[PDB]
Amino acid sequence: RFLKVKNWETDVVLTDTLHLKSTLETGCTEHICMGSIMLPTKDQLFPLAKEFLDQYYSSIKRFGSKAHMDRLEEVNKEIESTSTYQLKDTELIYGAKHAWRNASRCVGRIQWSKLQVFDARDCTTAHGMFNYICNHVKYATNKGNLRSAITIFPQRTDGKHDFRVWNSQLIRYAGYKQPDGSTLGDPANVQFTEICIQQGWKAPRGRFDVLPLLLQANGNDPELFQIPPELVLEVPIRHPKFDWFKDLGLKWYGLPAVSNMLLEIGGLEFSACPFSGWYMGTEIGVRDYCDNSRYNILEEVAKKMDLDMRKTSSLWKDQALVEINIAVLYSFQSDKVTIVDHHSATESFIKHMENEYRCRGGCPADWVWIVPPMSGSITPVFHQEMLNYRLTPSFEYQPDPWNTHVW
C-alpha cells in the first residue's frame, strides 16, 4: 500500500505515498491492465471543493487556520445558495499549475511551476475569446523564446452554456481529401477542416494552411476567426548536411498549444482552457512527419538518401527517421525557436521525478506516453518504473463539441 519504483539502469528505488490520494479511476482492474488504451448536483460539489481547498491551504502552510475555515465556510455558503462557486485568483493559479503538475502523460512537467495563467473568466463572446487567444499566442511565442501559458475561460454552469475551442490545437494545418484518393496536408485534420468549410472557411487548399479558430461562447453556435498570420511563427525545415532536404517544402509551426481538454479544479469544470509550451523534437519529426496516418514522408526522405529500401533489415526507415529528426532540431535551433530534444527532455523528467518523490511523496507518470517514440531505451525514462494514477486538479479529455452541440 506504500509503493516502490525502481530504475533498472541506476538501481535507484523511490517510495510512492502520493498515490493514496488518488481520486479518479484508471480503467485497470486486478484482472486486466488497460495501460495502453488511449482513452479509458450540490452534494457532489462541496466535498470536491473541500478537498481542493484543503490542499490549497496546506500548500500555503495555513491548514486549519482561520482564513482556511473562513474560506471553507464561504464556499459552503455559496454552493448552498448559488449551487456553484467561484475561485479566487490565487486558487485558480494554484489549480492550473497543479493540473499540469498532475498530468501523468507529460514529460515536460519539470517546468510546471513557471506557468503563466491568463484569467479569461470575464469573457462573454466568441469575439472576446479570439482576442484572448491572440494575446496568448503572442505572449507564448515571444519571438521564439517560448513561454508556458494557459488561458482559462468561464467555467461550466448548467452544461448548456459551455465555452469551447472547437480546434484540438490553436495552431494546426488543414487536411483535404483529394479526388485522387490521396490526402493533401495533415490527414489528422480532415474532419475538422470539413467543419470549417461547412461553417464557411475559404480554404486555400494548400499543404500547410493554418486552420481558422472555431470558437464557442456561452453555449452559442461557434464562430470562425483567423489567427493573424504574423502571430503564427513557423520554421522551414532544412538539414545541416543534406542540401536537398529543403527542397521537400517542409515547415512546421513553433507553438504547441492544446485547446480541447477540460481543466477540473475543486469540482469546477473549465471546458475551454488552451495551454501551450514548446515542442520536443520528436513530436514533429517522428509523429507529425513519419506517422503513416500523417505527412508520411519516410519513403521520400529515404529515396533522396539513396538507401536500400528493398529490405526492412537495412533499417532504411530508421536511418531516415534519425535524419528527419536531426533536421527538425537543426531548423528550430537555427531560427532561435525554443525546442527540446528527447534526450534532454527525458533527462529533465528524471530530475523532476526525483524532486517530486522527495518533496511530494510521488509523481504520477504514464510510461507508454513518457518514453519518446524513437530511441526509447537510450533515454533514461525507458528504464524507470512509473506508477500511473489520477490526481486532481487535472486536465481531462472531453467529447468533441460537434458530437454534442445542439445547433
Place this chain on the structure above:
Amino acid sequence: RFLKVKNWETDVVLTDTLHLKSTLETGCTEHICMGSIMLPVRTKDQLFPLAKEFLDQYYSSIKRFGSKAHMDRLEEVNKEIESTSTYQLKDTELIYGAKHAWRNASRCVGRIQWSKLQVFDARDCTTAHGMFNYICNHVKYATNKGNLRSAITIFPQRTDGKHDFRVWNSQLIRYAGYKQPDGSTLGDPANVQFTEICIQQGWKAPRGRFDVLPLLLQANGNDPELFQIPPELVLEVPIRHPKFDWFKDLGLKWYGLPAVSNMLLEIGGLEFSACPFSGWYMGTEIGVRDYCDNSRYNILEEVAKKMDLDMRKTSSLWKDQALVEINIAVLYSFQSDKVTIVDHHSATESFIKHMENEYRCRGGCPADWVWIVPPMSGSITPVFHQEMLNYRLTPSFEYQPDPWNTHVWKG
C-alpha cells in the same frame, strides 16, 4: 462482457472476450496502474480445480470435451492427487501446456511461432550431469548450424519445494562480467554477480570480454554443479558493418541462440522450475539493449567517435545515429553468416498479424505494450499505435526468485 482495442494508425477495432478466462491478477487496481513495473508447496486443496481447468481446456482444444476419455482423465488425476498430493501430465498434455504458456506470454513479440515449438521432455532426469546432457542436446538441436529452431526442455516438476530442479543461469548462453578494482567492468556488466557465483563454485575464468559462462545446474534440490558447454556447440557471430570497415576492429561478437533458463512453467497447477526455452533473436535485443544500454557493453560513445559525429551536444542526435548503425551491423552480420535473426520491423508486423488472427479465432491475445514495442524507432513500427490488453492466462511462464537467495545449502 466485451472489451475493444483500437489501432490508431488503421482504425481497426478488435473485440476481446478471452480476458473473461483470466484467473491470475495483474497488480493493477482501479486506482493505480502498474503497467511499467518490471516484476509486480501447494496443497491438494487448490490443486484439483487447477488441474480440472487445464484438462477442460486441453480436451476442448482436441474437440473431446465431455468425452469418456476426458472424464476418465479427470477421475484419474483426481485419485492421483488425493493419493499422492500431485499428478503427472501425459506427454500430449505437457506439449500442449508448453506451447500455450508461450502463446499466453503477453510480453513476447515472437508469438506468431508459438505452435512450432519443439518440446523435449526431461522429466526422467535425476542428476545435474543428466541436466547438462539434456541442455547440450537442446543447444545443438536449437542452433541447427544457424538455422535456428524454437525448443524447450522440461525438467521434473516441483514436489515439496525442497527438491527443485533449477538452472541457475538466467540464459543458457551468456558472457561473463568482471568488476575491476578500478570500478570498471570487463565483459557483460549484467552478469557480474552470477560470474562471481560461478568463480566461487570453482570456475576458472578466462577474464576476457566475451567468455561464455558455465552452466550451474541444480537437480532434485541438491547443491548446484558447474559444467562447461562444449565451445563447438556455441555458435557465435563476429559483428561487422556493411559500409564501415573499422567496425570489425571494435572486436564485437554475439552468440546466436537466445535461451531463457530462469523462468517457471505453470501447467495445470504443476510448477516446472527448470524449463529452459530458446528461439532466435530480434536484432534490437543485441544491438540496442545488449550493446547500447549504459548498464551493458555501452559502445555508443566509441561507435560515435569512429563515425566522428558531433558529440558535444545531444541535440545532434549522435546517440540515435550510432544506434541505427550498430543495429544495421548486427543484422548484416547474422544474415551474412546465415544465422537466423529478425529485424524489429518484420517482427512487429508479424505480431500484428498474429494478434489479429488470435482475436478472430481465440477471442483475444494478451499483450504487454511496454514490452512489445521495440526499444528503438517505436512509432514507425505498427505495434506502437496498437492498443493492447494485458492479462494473465494459464499455462504461463512466471518469474521466480533467484536460487542463490532461496537455496538451502548442503555443503
